[PDB]
Amino acid sequence: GFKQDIATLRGDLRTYAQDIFLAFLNKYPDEKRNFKNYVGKSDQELKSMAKFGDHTEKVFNLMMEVADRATDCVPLASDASTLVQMKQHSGLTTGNFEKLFVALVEYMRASGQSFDSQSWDRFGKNLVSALSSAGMK
């Protein structure tokens, strides 16, 4: 289920982080607008770019910690707060996070693997609510 999924993702985190973040940017091409340098690059080009690698792995490092501290796919209010207050997320709305989770869930459904995609879907919906409750627009 959900906890094992965190261990699976963490076991090849750089590849899953890139692959899911690219699924997100390809499903919602308007999202690349929140990152300048990303426009007009193919997936392989993005994976070469130092700042794509180091951003995307930090997103997934922290997202897995938030998942690991959750109870029954409900994240801690402290983790929502942290995500809201980050200077780098100033322009962001709960919509940006919804779309990341929809891509993550569709990635897991299309994989050959026994990911608990329904728990990830609940986790994303609970994280979106937490973010709103913590102050995100």
Ligand code: HEM
């Ligand atoms: C669970 C979801 C997410 C987590 C855990 C997360 C985490 C982080 C972290 C840790 C950083 C700072 C790392 C660094 O700059 O070295 C960061 C920066 C950033 N995040 Fe997020 N993030 C999430 C979702 C999103 C989404 C959905 C967007 C945009 C649609 C986004 C956009 C950014 C941007 C623009 C930055 C800074 C600029 C850059 O990446 O170069 N994040 N995020």
